[PDB]
Write a protein that binds this ligand. Structure first.
Ligand SMILES: Oc1cccc(-c2cc(Nc3cccnc3)nc(N3CCOCC3)n2)c1
Length: 808
């Protein structure tokens, strides 16, 4: 079809990858998956309420934080600005029908400046926007607008032993051999290796590697891992021994292998796209006492990063029907399985059929995600985790969306429950789909390993999001592509800003769309760009500082965005999303630590965009604008007095500081990134503190930053009242997180496995020490205070050293 061609062409443009490409494939799993997903896509399209899907009301079911539990709304019909008081449990329609008396009722209550609507049968106390404005004590300004026409959300019409024959490897450019492994969930079942031979542009063994395992004993999801050596590893490539159709693999295979540069990429079932420079390999296939109860309870009740010994697994397996009673033990129990034995696997399913407990149990995300990591290849084991995810509401789905998208790399096959799940939740929610779009486009644009699997998934989504969405994405992508070139061209080079003003002026011309949607915050529409406000930054990375006029006249603040190439913003995104999670955790405990998880979206290979926090500057700048390595205690406080004249304002900024400082002190501490520098810590003129550039720190001693300039602001020289207010919070905020150890851990693990040659046998096991695991809550309190003491003792010491290091 004429249009169908320009369609697939438009898709590819948005995707950043051509899915109809078939040059880098040895089978049809991808094409098979493209077609498989057609059902979930359309099945979801025809289920979503056109109205609710078009307005995407952002709501929640969770209770209201006590601190907030302790109101009126403004309206803006043109010149008319009627101000009305409403009961908390009033439907937006009831409030609307209430405005009908105090004055074709086919209108809707939108938000001033943003694309956020207040619709549906939901008490206004359940709209995240209202809740947000309360944690700020701001007036809820609503513009009486018309409902958006949903007509724009329409879519386009054998008992023998296993053996493989290694024909040989082909090198593009002394001694070498091939290791043929049989993995399942990162656990090797059998291993064979060829003889060593001197290097040549074509080493031919032509040998039959016989394995001790039998064909029937092969579990679906088992990978055939091929590795080349010299001892050191060089190239690696994988192959599902059982294809998407449950068929045992057969025939000739020539695989182009990925290279090592010494991790999730190690698992990918994809092959190296670049055939020119990739090493290749050709292969041929052609085929209950009290004690032992008390003894395993310790096993069940232990961190996910605690390895199971031989006896652990046996004990755990023998009493499997008793272990299946504790949901917090499933990961452990399914790790105790002999997947390389059909008889054993068959039993585990008999076991899974008896999920009386796991099904009815309250959703534990930390527990759920664990069955989705690299440790599980059994589609059935992984599928029971996705079932629990069906319970999540959008609000929560949005919290773990990033971590879930990454967990797709741990899937054996392209089409999967996890994959289909994201596609379903993204198609029901414009806001979830939006981020799904960029989260996927990010991986596709810097991960040769998983760009194929991901691209297929994104395409399945673009075909369902509707026409409206496609247009927004189109104008978003177009704009983003332009800004990225400018970012690069300028990084290659005051003659600089004169060059920026020049180039930027051309983009402004006519090529760019009038107004585009801010990727890290789709609620916002950025219109006309303010060239006179744009400037290049003074970092060696030389990022761009850009600002746009708010495309909505009923707002006129400028939208500040930063475009930067150099660092990997994927690491930043992960960290920031963890902070947002911590806040929710604290929110359940009526805790607000004023964390500032600014917007950040990776757009490609070590390049992306970052949100600008208004009236915020670097702590380092303050010390050097007043005083370079020299550090005075009064400087910080003086800066506040100045930036906040009204005593009422100043006194509140200090209250906002103590909390924000406590929040970041604890948050960074747990994530093991508290040891930073002044230049990497910022603060709002309103006293709100926050760290930045996380891609820099983890990408390359003091528990956290608690320097005497901070303490001075609290009133410490001398334990001030505020300082006690500080450490009191820290403890409360610290013990809170601990009640989610498992979650923080698995997130921490999936953050490095898919986000960072970071040792998992060491670094990964840092958070264990930090969260005082295996220690009573009371003991934990003392530890954190001890960590604070470390800061009191070092004072400026650490900072001065960072000043040295980052100068010499
Ligand atoms: O996550 C990353 C990664 C790399 C760089 C950053 C990064 C660096 C930076 N530097 C800066 C700004 C102003 C003055 N001096 C230095 N500012 C911000 N912002 C985000 C928060 O709002 C303020 C601007 N982010 C953040």
């Amino acid at each position: 079809s004429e249009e169908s061609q320009a369609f697939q062409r438009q898709l590819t443009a948005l995707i950043g990858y051509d899915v109809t490409d078939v040059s880098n494939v040895h089978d049809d799993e991808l094409e098979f998956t493209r077609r498989g997903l057609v059902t979930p896509r359309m099945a979801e399209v025809a289920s979503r309420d056109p109205k609710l899907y078009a307005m995407h009301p952002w709501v929640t079911s969770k209770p209201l934080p006590e601190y907030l539990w302790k109101i009126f709304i403004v309206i803006h019909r043109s010149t008319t600005s009627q101000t009305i008081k409403v009961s908390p449990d009033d439907t937006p329609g009831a409030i609307l029908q209430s405005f009908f008396t105090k004055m074709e009722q086919d209108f809707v209550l939108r938000v001033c400046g943003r694309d956020e609507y207040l619709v549906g049968e939901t008490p206004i106390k359940n709209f995240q926007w209202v809740r947000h404005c309360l944690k700020n004590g701001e007036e809820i300004h609503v513009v009486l607008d018309t409902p958006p026409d949903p007509a724009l959300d329409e879519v386009r019409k054998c008992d023998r032993k296993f053996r493989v024959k290694i024909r040989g490897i082909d090198i593009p450019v002394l001694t070498v051999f091939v290791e043929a492994n049989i993995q399942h969930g990162q656990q090797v079942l059998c291993q064979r290796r060829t003889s060593p031979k001197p290097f040549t542009e074509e080493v031919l063994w032509n040998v039959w590697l016989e394995f001790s395992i039998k064909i029937k004993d092969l579990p679906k999801g088992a990978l055939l891992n091929l590795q080349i050596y010299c001892v050191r590893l060089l190239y690696y490539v994988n192959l599902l021994l059982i294809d998407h159709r449950f068929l045992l693999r057969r025939g000739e295979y020539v695989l182009h292998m990925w290279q090592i540069s010494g991790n999730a990429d190690k698992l990918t079932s994809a092959t190296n796209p670049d055939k020119e420079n990739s090493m290749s390999i050709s292969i041929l296939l052609d085929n209950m006492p009290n004690q032992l109860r008390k003894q395993l309870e310790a096993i069940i009740a232990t961190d996910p990063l605690n390895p199971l010994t031989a006896e652990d697994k046996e004990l755990l397996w023998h009493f499997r029907y008793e272990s299946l009673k504790h949901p917090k033990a499933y990961p452990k129990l399914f790790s105790s399985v002999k997947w390389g034995q059909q008889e054993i696997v068959a039993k585990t399913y008999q076991l899974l059929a008896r999920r009386e407990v796991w099904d009815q149990s309250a959703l534990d995300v930390g527990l759920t995600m664990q069955l989705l990591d690299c440790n599980f290849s059994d589609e059935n084991v992984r599928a029971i985790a996705v079932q629990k995810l069906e319970s999540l509401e959008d609000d929560d789905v949005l919290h773990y969306l990033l971590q879930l998208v990454q967990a797709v790399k741990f899937e054996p096959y392209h089409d999967s429950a996890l994959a289909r799940f994201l596609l379903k939740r993204g198609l029901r929610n414009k806001r979830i789909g939006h981020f799904l779009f960029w989260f996927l486009r990010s991986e596709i644009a810097q991960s040769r390993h998983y760009q194929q699997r991901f691209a297929v998934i994104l395409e399945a989504y673009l075909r369902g999001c509707g026409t409206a969405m496609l247009h927004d994405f189109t104008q978003q992508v177009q704009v983003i592509e332009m800004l990225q070139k400018v970012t690069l061209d300028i990084k290659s080079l005051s003659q600089v800003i004169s060059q920026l003003k020049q180039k930027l002026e051309n983009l402004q011309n006519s090529q760019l769309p009038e107004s585009f949607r801010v990727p890290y915050d789709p609620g916002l529409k950025a219109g006309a760009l303010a060239i006179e406000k744009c400037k290049v930054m003074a970092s060696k990375k030389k990022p761009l500082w850009l600002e746009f006029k708010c495309a909505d006249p009923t707002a006129n603040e400028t939208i500040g965005i930063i475009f930067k190439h150099g660092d990997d913003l994927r690491q930043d995104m992960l960290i920031l999303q963890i902070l947002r999670i911590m806040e929710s955790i604290w929110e359940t405990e009526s805790l607000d630590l004023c964390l500032l998880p600014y917007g950040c979206i990776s757009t490609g290979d070590k390049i992306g965009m970052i949100e600008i926090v208004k009236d915020a500057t670097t702590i380092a700048k303050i010390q050097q604008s007043t005083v370079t390595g020299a550090f005075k205690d009064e400087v910080l406080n003086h800066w506040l007095k100045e930036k906040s004249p009204t005593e009422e304002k100043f006194q509140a900024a200090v209250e906002r500081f103590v909390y924000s400082c406590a929040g970041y002190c604890v948050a960074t501490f747990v994530l093991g990134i508290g040891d930073r520098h002044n230049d990497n810590i910022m603060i709002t003129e309103t006293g709100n503190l926050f760290h930045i550039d996380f891609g820099h720190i983890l990408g390359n001693r003091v528990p956290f930053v608690l320097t005497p300039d901070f303490l001075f602001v609290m009133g410490t020289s001398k334990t001030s009242p505020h300082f006690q207010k500080f450490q009191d919070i820290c403890v409360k905020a610290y013990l809170a997180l601990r009640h989610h150890t498992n979650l923080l851990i698995i997130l921490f693990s999936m953050m490095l496995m898919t986000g960072m040659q970071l040792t998992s046998k060491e670094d990964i096991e840092y958070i264990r020490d930090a969260l005082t695991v295996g220690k009573n809550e009371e003991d934990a309190k003392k530890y954190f205070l001890d960590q604070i003491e470390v800061c009191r003792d070092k004072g400026w010491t650490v900072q001065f050293n960072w000043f040295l290091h980052l100068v010499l």
